[PDB]
C-alpha cells in the first residue's frame, strides 16, 4: 500500500523520457542512469549498492537493443524492474513452520523500532491469514509499561500474554512460556525481547541466553525504516552478534525514500519478511519485492440487485485475488483520474437505497414524482437520481456490448 | 498589436469601462486579447474532466485590442506607444515620458 513515494517521484520523470522513445542509444541509457544514480543516492541507498546496481543495469540495457528492437524502452524498464526486484530480495520469503509445534519466533531490535506493536501485528496476521493459534510473551522487563502495553494488545486480539512480572529473568520467562505452549497446543510463540536506545554488551548477552534456552526457528529484527542507513547498520550488528533469519521493516507509512529496504539484503543477506504500515494491529503485510519494484517505477502488472452487489463489493468488499491487488495497486497506477467518490460514493449508496423492492427490480418503472419522492428521501433533488439512472443505462449498454 | 502578454491594461470601451487588468492571452490572428476581469460570461457545459459536476462556469471572454491602452509607468494614465532602439533590442516607449513598457 504505502512507501517509496519520493524515490518514485524522482525516477519516474527520467523513466518517462526513455519509455516514450522506443529507440535506445548509448547516450540515452547513460543519461537515464545518471538520474537513477542520483535518485538512489538521495534516497539514502547504500553507496556500494548504488554503484553495483547502476553497473549491472547499464550493462544489460545496451545489449538489450541488440537483445530486441521491439518495445526497446519498455525493455529498459523491465531490466530496471528486474534488478530492483533482486535488490529487495528475489521473491516473497515466507514464515518458517517448525516440524514440531510450537514455532518459536524471537523479536529483537532497539527501543522505538516497534517491537512490542509488531509482535501483536504478527500474532494477528498468523491467526487471520494462516489460521494459527499464537501466544505472546513478555520478555522485556526493563521498562515499566512494557508489559501492560503487550497485555493491552493481547486483550484486543483475545490471545494470551505470558508474564511473570519484572523481577524474573527473561531466560526463565521464555522457558516456561514455551512449555505452557506445548501443553496447551499453541502453534506459535512470539517473544517480545528487551532493548535500549543503542546496542550494548548486556543486551546481547541476554539475547544469546534467550536464543539458547528457546532454540527459536525465526529471529526477526524489527527496525525503523525511516532511519535509512542507520537501520542497515543495526541489522549488520544484530546479524553478527546473534543470528538473524528475517527483518520486519516498520513505519513505511512515513518513509518516502526507501534506502533501508533497497539495501538490507545486499549488506546483510537477511531477507525482509514483513512491512509495518501503521499504528493499528492490522497494518502488517508480507514484503513482496516484485510489487514494490513495480510501484517504484509506476508500472502495473436485476439492476437493483447488481447495484447493491457492486456497492457491497466496492465500498467495503475491497480485496481482489489472482493479481487483482497487484494490477490495482495505487488505484491501478492512478488511471489518469484524480477524483474518488468517497462521500460522493456514500451519497450514491444512500440514493441507491431510496427505493422499494419493485423499484429495485424495475428501475424504469419510477415515474417523475415517483423518484421525486425518492430524491426527497435521498437528499439530491433530481441530480443524484438522474445521474444514477444514466450510470445504470451506461452499465446496461456496456453489458450489452460485452455480451 | 500594441500590447503584449503581461501588460497592466486599463480598458477603454464596453460595459467594463475603465478598470485595471493583466493580459493572460493575446490572440493576434483575430486581434482579440483576453484581459482578466473583463467580459465575465457564463458558459454551460455538461461534461468536465477531472471530477464532472457540469454546472454553469464563470469565464472571461476576449475583447478587441482597440478597447485597450497600456499605462505609462510614471503617471499611471493611459497613453499611446512608440518604438525606439535602446542600444540593442527595440522597446515600447510610452508617450508623454521616456520610460519603457
Amino acid at each position: 500500500h504505502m512507501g517509496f513515494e519520493g524515490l518514485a517521484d524522482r525516477l519516474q520523470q527520467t523513466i518517462s523520457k526513455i519509455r516514450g522513445k522506443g529507440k535506445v542509444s548509448e547516450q540515452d541509457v547513460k543519461e537515464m542512469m545518471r538520474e537513477v544514480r542520483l535518485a538512489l543516492l538521495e534516497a539514502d541507498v547504500n553507496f556500494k549498492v548504488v554503484k553495483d546496481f547502476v553497473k549491472k543495469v547499464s550493462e544489460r540495457a545496451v545489449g538489450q537493443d541488440v537483445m530486441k528492437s521491439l518495445t526497446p524502452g519498455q525493455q529498459v524498464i523491465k531490466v530496471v524492474q528486474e534488478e530492483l526486484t533482486e535488490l529487495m530480495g528475489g521473491e516473497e520469503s515466507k514464515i518458517a513452520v517448525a516440524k514440531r509445534p510450537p514455532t518459536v519466533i524471537m523479536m529483537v531490535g532497539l527501543q522505538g523500532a516497534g517491537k512490542t506493536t509488531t509482535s501483536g501485528k504478527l500474532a494477528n496476521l498468523l491467526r487471520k491469514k494462516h489460521n494459527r493459534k499464537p501466544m505472546l510473551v513478555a520478555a522485556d522487563i526493563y521498562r515499566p509499561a512494557a508489559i501492560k502495553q503487550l497485555e493491552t494488545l493481547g486483550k484486543q486480539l483475545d490471545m494470551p500474554v505470558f508474564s511473570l512480572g519484572d523481577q524474573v529473568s527473561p531466560v526463565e520467562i521464555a522457558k516456561q512460556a514455551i512449555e505452557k505452549a506445548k501443553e496447551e497446543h499453541y502453534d506459535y510463540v512470539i517473544l517480545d525481547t528487551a532493548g535500549r536506545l543503542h546496542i550494548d554488551h548486556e543486551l546481547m548477552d541476554e539475547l544469546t541466553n534467550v536464543k539458547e534456552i528457546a532454540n527459536p526457528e525465526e529471529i526477526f529484527l524489527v527496525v525503523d525504516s525511516m532511519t535509512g542507513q542507520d537501520a542497515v547498520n543495526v541489522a549488520k550488528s544484530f546479524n553478527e552478534q546473534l543470528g538473524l533469519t528475517g527483518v520486519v521493516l516498520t513505519k513505511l507509512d512515513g518513509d518516502t525514500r526507501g534506502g533501508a529496504a533497497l539495501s538490507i539484503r545486499a549488506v546483510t543477506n537477511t531477507p525482509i519478511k514483513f512491512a509495518g504500515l501503521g499504528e493499528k494491529l492490522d497494518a502488517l503485510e508480507p514484503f513482496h519485492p516484485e510489487r514494490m519494484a513495480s510501484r517504484i517505477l509506476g508500472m502495473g502488472d436485476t439492476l437493483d440487485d447488481f447495484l447493491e452487489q457492486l456497492g457491497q463489493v466496492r465500498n467495503m468488499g475491497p480485496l481482489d485475488e489472482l493479481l487483482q491487488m497487484m494490477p490495482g495497486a495505487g488505484k491501478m497506477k492512478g488511471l489518469k483520474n484524480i477524483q474518488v467518490d468517497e462521500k460522493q460514493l456514500n451519497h450514491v449508496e444512500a440514493i441507491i437505497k431510496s427505493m422499494t423492492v419493485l423499484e429495485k427490480e424495475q428501475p424504469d418503472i419510477i415515474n417523475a414524482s415517483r423518484r421525486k419522492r425518492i430524491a426527497k428521501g435521498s437528499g439530491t433533488s433530481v441530480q443524484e437520481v438522474n445521474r444514477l439512472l444514466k450510470q445504470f443505462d451506461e452499465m446496461k449498454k456496456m453489458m450489452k456490448q460485452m455480451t | 498589436m500594441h500590447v503584449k502578454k503581461g501588460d497592466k491594461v486599463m480598458v477603454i470601451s464596453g460595459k467594463d469601462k475603465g478598470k485595471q487588468g493583466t493580459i493572460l492571452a493575446a490572440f493576434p490572428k483575430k486581434d482579440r486579447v483576453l484581459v482578466e476581469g473583463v467580459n465575465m460570461v457564463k458558459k454551460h457545459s455538461k461534461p468536465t474532466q477531472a471530477n464532472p459536476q457540469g454546472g454553469i462556469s464563470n469565464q472571461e471572454a476576449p475583447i478587441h485590442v482597440s478597447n485597450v491602452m497600456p499605462l505609462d509607468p510614471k503617471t499611471g494614465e493611459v497613453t499611446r506607444v512608440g518604438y525606439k532602439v535602446e542600444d540593442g533590442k527595440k522597446v515600447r516607449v510610452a508617450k508623454k515620458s521616456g520610460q519603457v513598457l
Binding site: 457492486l310 456497492g311 467518490d341 460514493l345 450514491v348 445521474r387 451506461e394 456496456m398 460485452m402 | -
Partner: peptide
C-alpha cells in the same frame, strides 16, 4: 470481456464511466 465490464461498472459506481 466480463472482467472489463465488471471493472467499468465498478468505476461508474465509484464515480462515472467515460461516454
Amino acid at each position: 470481456l466480463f472482467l472489463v465490464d465488471f471493472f467499468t461498472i465498478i468505476l461508474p459506481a465509484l464515480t462515472a464511466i467515460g461516454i
